[PDB]
Amino acid sequence: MYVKLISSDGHEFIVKREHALTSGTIKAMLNEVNFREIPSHVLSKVCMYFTYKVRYTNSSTEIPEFPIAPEIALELLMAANFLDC
Amino acid sequence: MTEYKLVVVGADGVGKSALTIQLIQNHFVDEYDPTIEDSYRKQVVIDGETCLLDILDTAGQEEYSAMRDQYMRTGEGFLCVFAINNTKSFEDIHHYREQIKRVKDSEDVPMVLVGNKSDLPSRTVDTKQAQDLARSYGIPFIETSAKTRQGVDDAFYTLVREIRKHKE
Amino acid sequence: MDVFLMIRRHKTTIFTDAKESSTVFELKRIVEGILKRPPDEQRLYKDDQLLDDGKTLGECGFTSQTARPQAPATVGLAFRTFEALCIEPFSSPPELPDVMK
Amino acid sequence: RPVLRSVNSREPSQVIFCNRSPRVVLPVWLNFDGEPQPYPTLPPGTGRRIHSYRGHLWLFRDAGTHDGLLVNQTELFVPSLNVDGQPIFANITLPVYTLKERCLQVVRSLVKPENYRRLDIVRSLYEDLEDHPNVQKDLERLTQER
Ligand SMILES: CC(C)[C@@H](C(=O)N1C[C@H](O)C[C@H]1C(=O)NCc1ccc2cnn(C)c2c1)n1nnc2c1CC[C@H](CCCN1CCCN(c3nccc(-c4noc([C@@]5(C)CCCc6sc(N)c(C#N)c65)n4)n3)[C@@H](C)C1)C2
Ligand SMILES: Nc1nc2c(ncn2[C@@H]2O[C@H](COP(=O)(O)OP(=O)(O)O)[C@@H](O)[C@H]2O)c(=O)[nH]1
Ligand SMILES: [Mg+2]
């Protein structure tokens, strides 16, 4: 099963349902979820965190650092605060 | 006039007090109170340099308080002494080095392994065992006898040189 | 072993994972289950390189070092003549505040 | 009184600290009264054979920022007795931080605390930025989660 996430600028991000449930706010709402508060370059980064979380939670290998460019840090912080992830 | 703070540690009865009194007062004490801990100062010429040696002859029961931790933290070099006729004293060396590493917040602390009472025939710890232990620690191993004065000056002067190499 | 990708066409981005040994055709079947288009009507790209169905993903250039969960590799997708590859760019972050240097 | 404390077992236990994280690890030992006691740090990718005791409690933090870290996939490490002298391994890694906490870390590392409130964010996040990682507070949370 997959979930479709719509950014505020109309980009469509299709992610595995289990990946989207990492967000508390998406979990509460739940096939398609529209976000007027997250642009595409931020929501794309958010989806990278989703696969990162599901891959490395309870991982028996070492966990790499999640990278965050300074230019996206402030907007990503607001998104994560809104998504509860 | 440079000063070197030396601390002599090891199990009770290994010869810490006898080694120290032999270095400063140049005589062998047959029965020094196992309870008296004191510091001794001596002006010595080591490799042409006149130094003040501040030797702590530790004694008493264990105490893992902040105050005793800090007291030992001030020592720049440690003489870890065991007796060749006492296996337990050799087995305790690991614990003494571990506590030195903890308070010095480092694993590269100037120290010398000392096998005392080398004048006694009743050996229970082999010199090869001590050489191997010293090699794994990366420290010199010196065989001493406070009674015959064997290696006594060498043990203390080598610890001073280990501090100098560490101070550079 | 596992490579993490984001397959992009126009304003659609698919976050999925695959095995480094899996082939390009097998990745088109993954897209089929999502976008309801058969592999015969899909063209996959790595940058501007048309990917041959028979080659594995590793042989195309997707490796664990370059296709990480936190940094997936981009795979362009075209649907059928075949259309020219078109990837609509994401939005842009604002200028970095001076308090952030 | 504190539940999270070391047991005074006095039974030695050989342990290997292994920093498999990109951070400088601050090993923190909870003494017999539950107080945190810092130990020498581990640069990234470094191992160290340490001398501990049975029933002693350990946690690991970022030496510079006190960010939380995991040991053997969990928050705390308690070595037991060695079986046939083989050492007990402690694999220290990053956790999977929440995206919000990872963002807080990156903003904390870029902005100076005086200029925290000069950012174009919500006032709620101004408090989250100033709420730096805290070992004593994490002990309260772990005590209650028990
Ligand atoms: C109380 C704590 C020290 C603690 C402990 O060790 N921990 C807590 C965590 O588990 C980790 C572990 C630890 O730190 N590992 C060392 C270490 C080092 C580097 C690194 C780097 N990273 N890491 C994580 C590191 C960890 N702890 N918890 N339980 C116990 C202890 C301490 C030992 C207790 C059992 C001892 C029983 N003895 C009775 C018989 C005779 N014995 C004896 N008799 C008289 C005196 C002494 C003695 N020993 O040292 C000293 C000196 C003077 C010399 C020297 C410097 C200091 S400093 C100080 N205060 C001293 C004193 N008095 C000394 N004299 N010894 C000895 C051999 C055994 C059981
Ligand atoms: N044969 C011999 N006996 C020693 C030597 N050093 C110390 N002793 C004896 O070992 C006993 C304990 O020595 P002591 O100085 O009290 O050691 P401490 O308890 O570590 O300070 C004393 O009765 C000494 O006479 C040595 O080098 N040779
Ligand atoms: Mg004495």
Residue numbers in the entry:
A (entry chain B): 17 to 46, 58 to 112
B (entry chain D): 1 to 168
C (entry chain A): 1 to 80, 84 to 104
D (entry chain C): 60 to 205
How is this structure described in the published paper?
Kirsten rat sarcoma viral oncogene homologue (KRAS), a key component of the pathway, is the most commonly mutated oncogene and is a key driver of tumor growth in several human cancers. KRAS cycles between an inactive guanosine diphosphate (GDP)-loaded and active guanosine triphosphate (GTP)-loaded state, acting as a molecular switch for downstream signal transduction. Proteolysis targeting chimeras (PROTACs) are heterobifunctional modalities, which recruit an E3 ligase to a protein of interest, resulting in subsequent ubiquitination and degradation of the target protein via the ubiquitin-proteasome system. Here, we address this gap through the development of heterobifunctional VHL-based PROTACs capable of engaging and degrading KRAS­(on), thus addressing a wider range of KRAS mutations.
Separation of 4 into all four of its diastereoisomers was carried out by supercritical fluid chromatography (SFC) to give PROTACs 5a, 5b, 5c, and ACBI4, which were profiled in both HiBiT-KRASG12D and HiBiT-KRASG12R cell lines. SPR data also confirmed ACBI4 to induce the most stable ternary complex of the two more active diastereoisomers, for both GCP- and GDP-loaded KRAS (KRASG12D-GCP + VCB: t 1/2 = 3,283 s, K d = 0.9 nM; KRASG12R-GCP + VCB: t 1/2 = 1,863 s, K d = 1.6 nM; KRASG12D-GDP + VCB: t 1/2 = 11,699 s, K d = 0.08 nM), with >35-fold improvement over the initial hit 3 for KRAS­(on)G12D and ∼20-fold for KRAS­(on)G12R. We consequently aimed to determine the stereochemical configuration of ACBI4 and rationalize what was driving cooperativity by solving its ternary complex structure. We crystallized ternary complexes of VCB-PROTAC-KRASG12D-GDP and -KRASG12R-GCP with ACBI4 and solved the cocrystal structures of both at resolutions of 2.19 Å and 2.85 Å, respectively. At these resolutions, the stereoconfiguration of the isopropyl group could not be unequivocally assigned from the map density. Based on extensive knowledge of the stereochemical preference of the alkylic side chain at that same α-carbon in high-affinity VHL ligands , and our ternary structures of compounds 1, 3, and ACBI3, the α-carbonyl stereocenter bearing the isopropyl group has been assigned as the (S)-configuration in our refined structure.
